[PDB]
A paper describes a structure:
To provide insight into the structural prerequisites and find potential exploitable differences between AfERG10A and human orthologues, structures of apo- and CoA-complexed AfERG10A were determined using crystals grown from conditions of 0.1 M HEPES (pH 7.0) and 2 M ammonium sulfate in the absence or presence of CoA. In one asymmetric unit, there are four molecules (A to D) forming a tetramer, which is similar to other members of thiolase family, such as in humans, S. cerevisiae, and E. coli. By comparison, the root mean square deviation (RMSD) value between the apo- and CoA-bound structures is 0.175 Å, with 367 atoms matched, suggesting that CoA binding does not cause major conformation change. Although the catalytic machinery of AfERG10A and human ACATs is fully conserved, a close inspection of the CoA binding site revealed exploitable differences. For instance, residues binding to adenosine 3′-phosphate of CoA are Asn257, Leu258, and Arg259 in AfERG10A, whereas they are Arg258, Val259, and Asp260 in ACAT1 and Gly225, Ser226, and Asn227 in ACAT2. Met286 in AfERG10A binding to the pantetheine moieties of the CoA molecule is equivalent to Leu286 in ACAT1 and Ile254 in ACAT2. Those differences reveal that AfERG10A possesses potentially exploitable differences in the CoA binding site compared to the human orthologues. Encouragingly, by solving the crystal structure of AfERG10A and superimposing it with structures of human orthologues, four different residues within the CoA binding site were discovered. This will be the structural basis for a rational design of specific antifungal inhibitors targeting AfERG10A.
In this study, we have characterized recombinant AfERG10A as a functional acetyl-CoA acetyltransferase catalyzing both synthetic and degradative reactions. Unexpectedly, AfERG10A localizes to the mitochondria in [name], as shown by C-terminal green fluorescent protein (GFP) tag fusion. Both knockout and inducible promoter strategies demonstrate that Aferg10A is essential for the survival of [name]. AfERG10A consists of three domains, an N-terminal domain (residues Glu36 to Asn153 and Asn287 to Arg302), a C-terminal domain (residues Ala312 to Asp433), and a loop domain (residues Met154 to Met286).
Numbering used by the authors:
A (entry chain C), B (entry chain D): 36 to 433
C (entry chain A): 32 to 433
D (entry chain B): 35 to 433
The structure:
Amino acid sequence: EIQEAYILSGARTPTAKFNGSFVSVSAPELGAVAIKSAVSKSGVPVEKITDVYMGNVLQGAVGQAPARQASMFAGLSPTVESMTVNKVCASGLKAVALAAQNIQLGLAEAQVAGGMENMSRVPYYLPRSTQLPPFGEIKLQDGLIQDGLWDVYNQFHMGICAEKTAKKYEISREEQDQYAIQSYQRAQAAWKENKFAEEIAPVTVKGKKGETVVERDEGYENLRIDKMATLKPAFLRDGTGTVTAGNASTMNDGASALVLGSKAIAREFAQGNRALARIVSTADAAIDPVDFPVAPAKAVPIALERAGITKDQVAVWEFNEAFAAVIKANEKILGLQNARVNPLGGAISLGHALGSSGSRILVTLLHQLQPGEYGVAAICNGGGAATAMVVQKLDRVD
Amino acid sequence: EIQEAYILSGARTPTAKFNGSFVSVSAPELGAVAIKSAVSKSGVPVEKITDVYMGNVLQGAVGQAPARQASMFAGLSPTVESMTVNKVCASGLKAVALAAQNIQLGLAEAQVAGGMENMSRVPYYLPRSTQLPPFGEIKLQDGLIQDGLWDVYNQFHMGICAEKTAKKYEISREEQDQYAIQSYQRAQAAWKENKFAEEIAPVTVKGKKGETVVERDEGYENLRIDKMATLKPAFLRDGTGTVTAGNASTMNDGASALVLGSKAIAREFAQGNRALARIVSTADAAIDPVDFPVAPAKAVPIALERAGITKDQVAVWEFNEAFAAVIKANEKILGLQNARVNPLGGAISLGHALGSSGSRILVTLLHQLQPGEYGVAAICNGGGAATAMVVQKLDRVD
Amino acid sequence: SALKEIQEAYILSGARTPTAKFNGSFVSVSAPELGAVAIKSAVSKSGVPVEKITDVYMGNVLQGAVGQAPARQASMFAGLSPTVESMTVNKVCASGLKAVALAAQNIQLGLAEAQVAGGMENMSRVPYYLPRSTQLPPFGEIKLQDGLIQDGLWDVYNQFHMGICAEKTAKKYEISREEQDQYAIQSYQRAQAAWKENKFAEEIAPVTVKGKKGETVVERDEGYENLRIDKMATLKPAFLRDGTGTVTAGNASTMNDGASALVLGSKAIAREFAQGNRALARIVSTADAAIDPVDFPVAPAKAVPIALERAGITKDQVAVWEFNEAFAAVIKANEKILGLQNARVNPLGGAISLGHALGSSGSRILVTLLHQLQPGEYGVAAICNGGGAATAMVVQKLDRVD
Amino acid sequence: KEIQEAYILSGARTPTAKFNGSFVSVSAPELGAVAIKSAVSKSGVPVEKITDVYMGNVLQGAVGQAPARQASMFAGLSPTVESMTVNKVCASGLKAVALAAQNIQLGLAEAQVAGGMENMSRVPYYLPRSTQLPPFGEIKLQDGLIQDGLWDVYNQFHMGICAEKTAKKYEISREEQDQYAIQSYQRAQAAWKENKFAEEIAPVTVKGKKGETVVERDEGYENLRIDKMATLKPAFLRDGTGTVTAGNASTMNDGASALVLGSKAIAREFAQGNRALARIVSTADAAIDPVDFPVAPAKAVPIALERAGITKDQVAVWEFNEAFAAVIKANEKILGLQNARVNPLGGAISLGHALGSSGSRILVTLLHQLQPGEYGVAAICNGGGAATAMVVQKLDRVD
Ligand SMILES: CC(C)(COP(=O)(O)OP(=O)(O)OC[C@H]1O[C@@H](n2cnc3c(N)ncnc32)[C@H](O)[C@@H]1OP(=O)(O)O)[C@@H](O)C(=O)NCCC(=O)NCCS
Ligand SMILES: CC(C)(COP(=O)(O)OP(=O)(O)OC[C@H]1O[C@@H](n2cnc3c(N)ncnc32)[C@H](O)[C@@H]1OP(=O)(O)O)[C@@H](O)C(=O)NCCC(=O)NCCS
Ligand SMILES: CC(C)(COP(=O)(O)OP(=O)(O)OC[C@H]1O[C@@H](n2cnc3c(N)ncnc32)[C@H](O)[C@@H]1OP(=O)(O)O)[C@@H](O)C(=O)NCCC(=O)NCCS
Ligand SMILES: CC(C)(COP(=O)(O)OP(=O)(O)OC[C@H]1O[C@@H](n2cnc3c(N)ncnc32)[C@H](O)[C@@H]1OP(=O)(O)O)[C@@H](O)C(=O)NCCC(=O)NCCS
């Protein structure tokens, strides 16, 4: 009765800087680029793909039905069904977990799933006339802040949440910054050898003169060891701050996508796929909103149990580097310091376009795997939660 | 080992009019009132409920993680996972189907699911500094139009889609107004017989001068039979037009929620439950974006084949009345013109809070079925899709 | 042209529109459209042929979104020829009076024989400010200032409302909550009484507002029947919430929409066309003075003596005083300093009860002052203005010039 | 009781900065304060004698309360100094000087400060209050620069359109306009190579997060590109008949300017030998139909010449604001000033046009070009159909 789901491909766009190369390109347009490549590399006749699920946290001004736009701009048939998913930062992974379910229940044989975000293109919000005062100062919220990084209950940024955790586990400035430098170092190492060449789909942004062709993550080069310890705290300006702009994730523009199928679909069209893998298990989990940084420490045991697997059978972990504070706490709680986490860099140097990051880390994870090895992809999200996915890399199906 | 999933309760707030009673109540607050009533009427201990899935189409300035807010403002534990869903007008019904998938897969035993929408509180968009011109006039889009009711591909209103449907299937102005007059009469007859007292959870509005319990839907009493045939078409003003404000659905604020159950949970805690039912099947289907009004005609026959029944075995049909033209088209294509279709009114008279509408017709449907009878909830969404659910009403499970 | 000796200037006519409430009857009517209504009526009542009027000077504090050259619009909307010259004046609340004094200098120098001066203000229509792309942050909360506060009611140097300036003056000159309230109650009474006898009928130019399906004619001031005597002593201070607060919404002026205008002329023009004019009077003197920005409520105490000295008259020779009632605190401090306690200051009400359309107020008080004087009588219009300043004018009511 | 004369004792201007350039963080009143401070220092008059500050400012949105008060106060002038912000559109700065002159003429004052200021970069967009907003649907937000500064109310078009119509009527062709515009740039460059503007310019110290910048040079006079000039699209009329371009029109800029005026007595006791010493002989304002605002200086000049008792041939240097090349070319035809000394060191096309300061900026530039005893004319047109003209006479001493 219940079947399993296979990843056939993975294609993310280059992660652009805030107010950078993708300011002209809507999140769906980025999404379509990531989709068009992923299908191409999967092998499956498109006709077999039936649904497109895409994460998107900030849908303000994106237009009607963001995920639908991705599907249409990708050249997929109006006949394909779609849905825009919002689990804050877990959105991209969750969209893959849900697309999996259509296959696990036999409802479909091929699905497209991932995430997209253009944080440069998020608007400010001007209330309509019945919610404006008759006179006096009006405060306009950015939307990146209000809907993306502002905790509703404690009424403070996600960076304060990261301070309260960095305090509670005795994580210090100098090891947050060491982790950051390492993030950047690993990202530079990786780009020197062009370790993301195969996984990246290049974005042709046209405008005025002719066409740029963007191929390269923006922000990984830009590390300056000297300044790193001089960097002022970014959220906590009371004396005790530790999280800075250098040791936090950056705001970014980009999109990622994966093609999924049944056993039957893989066997018939995707046996020698670069990305090839089996979705072993997934799991969500929630705790108090403040404690969102460790919510991965609660969602990975579950996914692992559901996997029938232990910490020590997992080759490479890919946690989303939302802060250095975060990774380091989750490393100390799961006892993974001496394990292969974010070998090619993370959100601190590779960027963090919200709705995409869940699926982007998976795409990166699938290209660092030897046949038979177990991969984990985990990602915290605001509100107090995470989702983790256990996958296994394969050369073939049977 | 694919499981069955049961609806155990169904609750909704009153549908308030645009710029009316709920201008100060956010969509998650309204969704939280509807969630509180559904968990109470379910009769299942809160601890077995592990996920909240809520539709919300226009998430702008609602705050981080709208569905999570709903879950928390209703007093569900920080430990319950959540996800905000966007399939436009179909979001609430899709949210139900997703919660079902969890039970159907054995990942949970109880879910809550539905939708919320505050169209009054949808903001205007102000692009950030990098997307504003150096000088000259700037046009701020209203979120209702840009993300809610504007087709991305053809660049016109949803009700131009309705017009191009009414032309194709020869549904005249007179036929459209006749159906709208019937919708209002059915809503008035239902409100006069108090047919919604059981499904409605009142809303407590905290003003300055005391409180206000809102218990009545707003809009359904505003019919003037005289003026209905003299209204000016609201979308097509070139003299060919047919869709008016009267024969179309209004913009409203409201929320709806249902508790879902495994067979085991239903048998142990929901015997005799007023709204008890089994989900027999669910289907999504998509076509050309222009043709989103006739997408139910493509989803309904799919959900009936998965349910193993035919059109003739369903006792009550609940199709969202986005426009009168929408219903009359689908009744013609499906041969349901003499069937029991929206007997207690619909969105023309009872309103249309985008992300709640899909699950609101579900709640309304459950209260009109006799034990052993099949019902069908179908709702079209922007982009060219529709979601349909077949349900079998029960008195007890054996 | 020019002239070797300073000539005399006379006011031939005076008109004002009703003073409407903030966000009230004039939301659809721009300050120059309002100015134009007052202007049309003033030239119509003056008896001088329009070809003789050569310049229009109108006061206007908040000019955002009003369009190019606001005083030029009042002129063209009043039907004056395109050859008449114009200028928009900004001396904050003293704008309307200052425009009169400037229009009188043209006649005093012999450069002109007939002028139009006054002021207009539509506080409902002043907008919010959104800075352009280069002055906005890349991200984060944006604060939109309301032009009323940023450009009209906010001190630049002290960074506080004009009502805090009123607060510090009330303390300095020991003006109590009770005196403030008692003054405001009187203003309301004096206005109600004045309105019951139709005292404003001659000076008021009605406004016709084209609304959706049909026209509405406005000829009555809005806000003067809004006194509830018993609530007065209970109102929360509007600006100072630390316990020392004293100024409230009942004892302070309101924000309003209105316009006022006068025709002025040379002796020769007055003799030929305005001998029995209802409003006919001579501008005897003007004076502007300034002190520290926080002490603006008492700047009129500095302007008045200078104006009186330039007129060769004493306090005791002034029949009716018309001081803008910015706050009750302001009027009482100025009565203290000048020893007017037992004088007739604002007999038919003022700003507290009849409103305060900023740039129109200076010429609105003049218009009201000219309709209350008897032949030969000396009148004084004075008005403080933010930044620390005031302007006073002495006039002499006459039946004829010879 | 007898009308007297007014004298100019000193003049300065800040440098004219480019739109969105060096002065985006410096408000018009701060720019004003720099020019007032320099004019007051160079006048040689004790500061207790100056009693009024009249400053032009056209776009007063978000500048704060009483912009001319701010200018006075930021220059360290005392709070007893009276002030007023004047709005005659582009004539604002010249009209302020005339008004200050009137006080001295009527004997109400012995020393005055007058000039103009504008920060076009800092002009804001206008958002209406809740009672003027539609309850739903698209909202259009006007730029103040367009709505209040450059849009004719009666004809509902840009000032550049008014320029096109004066070009048609006076047969000024795209070629004539470009030649005059090129010429303006070359004069400006010539003047900057000879450091002609050093005596009148008051440097602006712009505070920054990473250091202070001292701006002492006009911005935009090197942007001439003769090649490009004839290949430019019409800026305002795009119906195939347009002749006005960004090249041959004035630019938008930020800047200020200021002069100290005085009575004969004050001039004699403290300003003998002052570089900018001159006598205000006459001033005139004039208006006609709004669309004909570009030819309005032609009505104003004759009146000012008549009141000064001089002929057009008796004026050594003419300073007409170069709002567009077409306006200068049309005014030269009407007045017969084809071979006259007109805008010899350049003008608004190359040197910029900070709306409320231009009127007084051309006067400052004029005063530094005149020989002792020579007559000069400053004239500037303004939106709505008007113009202001001032006749001066350069002096070495008063007697
Ligand atoms: C940090 C953040 C808040 C914005 O930072 P910012 O204010 O734009 O910071 P900048 O990029 O200007 O950098 C600040 C300084 O650090 C320096 N800096 C940047 N990257 C650096 C690096 N790798 N090494 C050293 N210094 C660095 C910058 O050069 C700058 O110095 P400068 O001002 O002298 O130029 C945002 O990027 C962010 O990631 N915040 C949280 C993101 C998020 O999603 N939060 C929750 C996730 S669940
Ligand atoms: C209603 C809507 C179409 C815009 O119309 P509107 O301008 O708000 O119209 P209103 O309802 O305010 O009033 C329109 C007129 O019709 C009248 N009217 C409306 N319903 C009526 C009825 N049942 N009987 C009689 N008269 C009625 C009103 O009284 C009014 O008369 P008036 O113009 O003489 O004052 C708007 O809700 C919209 O944008 N579309 C609906 C949302 C939608 O399309 N959703 C579908 C998503 S799939
Ligand atoms: C003072 C000011 C802020 C008042 O704004 P506001 O709060 O909107 O004023 P309100 O509409 O609240 O004034 C009425 C309020 O006080 C009460 N009130 C006001 N005037 C009253 C009176 N004369 N008698 C009794 N009650 C009165 C009203 O009933 C209401 O109280 P409520 O809320 O309990 O019903 C405003 O008028 C202002 O900014 N102007 C003062 C200064 C100024 O305009 N410029 C200075 C000139 S240089
Ligand atoms: C200020 C103004 C110049 C700005 O217009 P703009 O469109 O930004 O023009 P730019 O300065 O960008 O230049 C336009 C083009 O001409 C070019 N150009 C500008 N000045 C030039 C010059 N002197 N020589 C050659 N080419 C020039 C630019 O490089 C650009 O070409 P590009 O497309 O290759 O970049 C003008 O359009 C304007 O609005 N002026 C208002 C007129 C006014 O002040 N009225 C006052 C009435 S009294």
